[PDB]
A paper describes a structure:
YTHDF proteins bind the N6-methyladenosine (m6A)-modified mRNAs, influencing their processing, stability, and translation. The YTH domains of YTHDF1, DF2, and DF3 share a common fold with a central β-sheet surrounded by five α-helices. Three conserved tryptophan residues largely define the hydrophobic pocket involved in m6A binding.
The Se atom appeared to be involved in a covalent bond with Cys412. The ebselen molecule sits on a very shallow groove with one side resting on the locally hydrophobic protein matrix, while the other face remains solvent-exposed. However, in the two protein chains in the asymmetric unit, ebselen preferentially adopts two slightly different poses. In the first case, the selenobenzene moiety almost inserts between the aliphatic segments of the Lys471 and Lys473 side chains while also contacting the intervening Gly472; the N-phenyl amide group stacks to Tyr408 concurrently interacting with the Arg404 and Ile410 side chains. Electron density is missing for a relevant part of the extended β4−β5 loop (residues 460–469), which is then flexible and disordered. Although binding at a site different from the m6A pocket, the ebselen molecule impedes the conformational rearrangement of the β4−β5 loop into the m6A-binding-competent conformation. The selenobenzene ring in both ebselen poses clashes with YTHDF1 residues Ser461–Ala462 in the m6A-bound structure, while the N-phenylformamide group either collides with Trp465 or Val464. Finally, ebselen displacement of both Trp465 and Trp470 generates a unique pocket extending to the m6A-binding region that can be exploited by ebselen derivatives with improved potency.
Numbering used by the authors: 363 to 458, 471 to 558
The structure:
Amino acid sequence: ESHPVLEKLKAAHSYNPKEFEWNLKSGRVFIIKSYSEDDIHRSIKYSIWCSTEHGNKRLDSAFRCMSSKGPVYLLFSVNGSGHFCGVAEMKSPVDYKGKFDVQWIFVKDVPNNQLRHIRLENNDNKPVTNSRDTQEVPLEKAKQVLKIISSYKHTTSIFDDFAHYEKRQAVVEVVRKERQSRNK
Ligand SMILES: *[Se]c1ccccc1C(=O)Nc1ccccc1
């Protein structure tokens, strides 16, 4: 059994494309650390993301700075998960408590031990897997990461739990509407 929302998404977008240009002529790449998989699910189906106030200021600056001379890529990982779950392109400046359009491109789990050997000189040579939200990846290291994520033969992705997230969100909504109703 597959969910019809996921089927509409799969038919309308080309997730995990076989021909992806990882050796960029230009562009900038950033690590997004999400608090939960729920946020990732919502982001994939609505093509939207928000960081913190400072995160949105930095991503705003990067997007407007690039002036469509190249892409701005976001590599997503949930705090404490041990893998990246996909990559999306930032597609609009931040709109104002600050949201912005994103286009998901890769939706696949890449374990951290596939990427931990890549270290970030602008972050005390710490592994790319030990980054904070909106940490920028140097371009050549970005190409190493994009190549690895693009070519990895993933065995799973958040899509495998799609219906589960669908149900969670729905229950949460009712739980809120009832609780709020009980207050007034
Ligand atoms: Se973020 C945000 C800010 C203002 C209005 C709406 C949103 C939104 O839809 N956010 C969201 C989508 C997916 C995952 C996390 C947050």
